[PDB]
Design an enzyme around this catalytic site. Structure first.
Site, PDB file in Angstrom:
ATOM      1  N   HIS A  82      -0.392   5.577 -10.461  1.00 60.57           N
ATOM      2  CA  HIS A  82      -1.379   6.485  -9.873  1.00 60.57           C
ATOM      3  C   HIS A  82      -1.183   6.598  -8.393  1.00 60.57           C
ATOM      4  O   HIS A  82      -0.939   5.571  -7.722  1.00 60.57           O
ATOM      5  CB  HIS A  82      -2.835   6.001 -10.058  1.00 60.57           C
ATOM      6  CG  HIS A  82      -3.257   5.740 -11.455  1.00 60.57           C
ATOM      7  ND1 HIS A  82      -2.862   4.603 -12.114  1.00 60.57           N
ATOM      8  CD2 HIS A  82      -4.110   6.437 -12.239  1.00 60.57           C
ATOM      9  CE1 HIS A  82      -3.427   4.678 -13.307  1.00 60.57           C
ATOM     10  NE2 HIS A  82      -4.186   5.766 -13.424  1.00 60.57           N
ATOM     11  N   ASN A 113       3.449  -1.715  -8.267  1.00 62.84           N
ATOM     12  CA  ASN A 113       2.225  -1.123  -8.803  1.00 62.84           C
ATOM     13  C   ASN A 113       1.083  -2.138  -8.869  1.00 62.84           C
ATOM     14  O   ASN A 113      -0.023  -1.814  -8.446  1.00 62.84           O
ATOM     15  CB  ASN A 113       2.501  -0.526 -10.196  1.00 62.84           C
ATOM     16  CG  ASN A 113       1.495   0.475 -10.737  1.00 62.84           C
ATOM     17  OD1 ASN A 113       0.437   0.769 -10.147  1.00 62.84           O
ATOM     18  ND2 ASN A 113       1.845   1.051 -11.882  1.00 62.84           N
TER      19      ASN A 113
HETATM   20 MG   LIG Z   1      -1.621   1.353  -9.704  1.00 60.32          MG
END
Ligand SMILES: [Mg+2]
Ligand SMILES: [Cl-]
Ligand SMILES: [Cl-]
Ligand SMILES: [Cl-]
Ligand SMILES: [Cl-]
Ligand SMILES: [Mg+2]
Ligand code: NA
Ligand code: NA
Lengths: 290, 290
Positions: A82, A113
Site C-alpha cells: 500500500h 513493507n
Molecule cells: Mg504496508
C-alpha cells in the site's frame, strides 16, 4: 487543431482519481500509482474498520488492460505494498477497502513493507499527536545506477502477465501543520528509501532529500500552492523525526499481542525479558485483561 | 476532498500541449514526449520552410527542471530524433521550428534516424498521395527483455546531466482516410521498431503489431473516438505498405543532389552507374539544370 484531434488525442490515463480518504494518479504503462496523496488526523486513524475484512482487487475504475491483478503479485517474490496505508483509515470501512484497490498498490520488498516502511507509516500517524493535520504523498521510483565505465542505466523488473513495474525506491513527502490558525511555515520532509531490507541501524534522516531533488527525480511538482520561499520549513528542524528503534518497536508489537485468549500473556512477558520488557502504559493493559 | 487538495494535488505534467501542426503529452520524469500526434496532407508537406534555419532548443513552455537541453544529447552517442518530423511541416516556418523544441525530441540511434525511421516518415508522407488525410501518433518505448532464468527486466540508458531516457523502441500509429465523404473504415497500422540500425532487408510489416498490443505495451489509448469494431481496417489490406528499397532510396537521394552549382551532375550519374541509374522523372530534372 479540430483536424488534429478529429478522432481525439491519445489517452494518457494519468488524471487524478479521488477516493474516500485518498487521491492518486495512475501510471497506465507501469500498472502502479505514480503518486498517492492522503490527509491524516488524530480522528481518521481511530475506528472499527478491520484490515481482515479487506481484499486486494483490481480498481473497478481502471481499464482492465492497464490494471494489475493479484496473479501478477502472488508468487512473484514481491508483496502488495500500500501507498496510502490501510492503517490510516480506521475511521472508514469504505476508505480502507479503496486502499486495497491495486491502483494504490506497488510491488514492495516483503521486509521493507513490514519493517522500515511500516515504521515510516507509524511515524506519519504519530505526527497527528503533534500536528492537527498531516498530508502525505507516497509513490514508487525507478532510479538509475552509474556503472564503472560512467554509463547511467535504469534497470527494473516487471512481474506477472501484466508486467507490473517493481520500483527501485519508494518516496514519502510529509506535510504537517500545527493548527488551522497557525501562521508559522508548514513542516515538510521528503524521503527516498530503497525497495529492500533496511533494518534499525539507518536513521530516517539518512534517507532525507530536498523537495527539489525529489521533484527532479520523480518528474512531479508536490503541493503546488505552497510558496517554497515562505511556506515551507524542514520537519527535522521542528520535530524529533525518529522512527521507533528495535526495543520500542518490539514492545509495540507485544502490546498489540496483549488482546488475544488463554494465559499466553505470561509467554509474551517471558519473550520480552529473554532483554527489553519495561514501559508503564504496557502494564495498564497487561492487567486490564487478567 | 477540500482538506485533501488544500495545497493542491501533485502536478503530473502529462496534459496535452498544442503547437501549430502537432500536439504532444510530455513525460516530465523521462524528459521525452510520451506521444506526439500530427495531421499531414498533400499541401502541408509542400512549402518554403527550410530545416537549416531551425535550431534544437528546450521547449519554452516546459519547466526547465523537467526539460532536456542540447548538452544532454551532444556527445551522448545518440541523436536528437524528431517524433513529429520537420519534413512534414514545409507549409509553415512556425510549425517546423516548434518540432525542434526538445519536447518533440527523443535520443534516437544515428543510423535509425537517417535510415529506417526516415523511410517510415517518407512512407507517411507518400500516403497523402493516396489518402486525403493522414494522422500519425509517434513516440518512444522502454520494453522488457526476458533473461534465460525467466526474469523480465526493463533496462534503459539515461543521458546527460538531466538523465534523458533512451528508448529501446519507437512506435508509429498511422491513421489514413481517403476523403471527407468516404464511409469505408479508416486504414490503421501500428508499428514498433527497435532504436538501432535496421537496414533494407526487414520489411515494415515485420514490425507491425496490433493496436491493442501497442496500447498494452505503451499504456495509451490511441484515437479514442474510433469504434474498433466498425471504423478500423488494417492498412496492409488496402495499401502497398512498403518503404523504398536500396535502389529506390539511393535514387531519391541522388535526385535531391540534383539542385546544387558546377558540373558535379556528371559525378552523381557516375556513382549511380558504379548499379541503379534509371528512372524517367530523374532525367526531367537532370536536364532542366544544364
Ligand atoms: Mg504496508
Ligand atoms: Cl502480498
Ligand atoms: Cl526493513
Ligand atoms: Cl543530433
Ligand atoms: Cl537503419
Ligand atoms: Mg529524423
Ligand atoms: Na507472478
Ligand atoms: Na552528454
Amino acid at each position: 487543431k479540430a483536424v488534429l484531434e478529429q478522432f481525439g488525442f491519445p489517452l494518457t490515463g494519468t488524471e487524478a482519481r479521488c477516493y474516500t480518504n485518498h487521491a492518486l494518479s495512475y501510471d497506465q504503462a507501469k500498472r502502479v500509482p505514480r503518486w498517492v496523496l492522503e490527509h491524516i488526523s488524530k480522528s481518521k486513524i481511530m475506528g472499527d474498520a478491520d484490515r481482515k475484512h479487506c481484499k486486494f482487487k483490481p480498481d473497478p475504475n481502471i481499464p482492465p488492460t492497464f490494471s494489475a491483478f493479484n496473479e501478477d503479485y502472488v508468487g512473484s517474490g514481491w508483496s502488495r505494498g500500500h501507498m496510502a496505508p490501510a492503517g490510516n483509515n480506521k475511521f472508514s470501512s469504505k476508505a480502507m477497502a479503496e486502499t486495497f484497490y491495486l491502483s494504490n498498490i506497488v510491488p514492495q520488498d516483503f521486509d521493507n513493507n513490514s519493517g522500515y516502511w511500516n515504521r515510516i507509516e507509524m511515524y506519519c500517524r504519530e505526527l497527528t499527536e503533534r500536528f492537527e493535520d498531516v498530508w502525505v504523498v507516497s509513490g514508487p521510483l525507478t532510479l538509475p545506477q552509474t556503472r564503472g565505465d560512467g554509463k547511467k542505466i535504469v534497470s527494473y523488473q516487471v512481474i506477472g502477465e501484466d508486467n507490473v513495474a517493481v520500483p527501485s525506491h519508494l518516496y514519502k513527502v510529509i506535510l504537517a501543520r500545527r493548527s488551522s490558525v497557525s501562521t508559522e511555515p508548514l513542516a515538510l520532509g521528503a524521503f527516498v528509501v530503497p525497495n529492500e531490507a533496511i533494518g534499525f541501524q539507518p536513521q530516517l534522516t539518512e534517507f532525507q532529500v530536498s523537495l527539489q531533488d525529489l521533484e527532479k527525480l520523480s518528474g512531479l511538482v508536490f503541493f503546488p500552492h505552497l510558496d517554497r520561499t515562505s511556506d515551507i520549513r524542514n520537519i527535522c528542524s521542528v520535530d524529533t523525526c525518529k522512527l521507533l528503534d528495535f526495543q520500542e518497536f518490539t514492545l509495540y508489537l507485544s502490546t498489540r499481542k496483549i488482546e488475544g485468549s488463554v494465559l499466553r500473556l505470561e509467554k509474551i512477558m517471558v519473550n520480552l525479558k529473554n532483554e527489553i520488557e519495561p514501559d508503564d502504559y504496557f502494564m495498564s493493559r497487561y492487567e486490564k485483561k487478567l
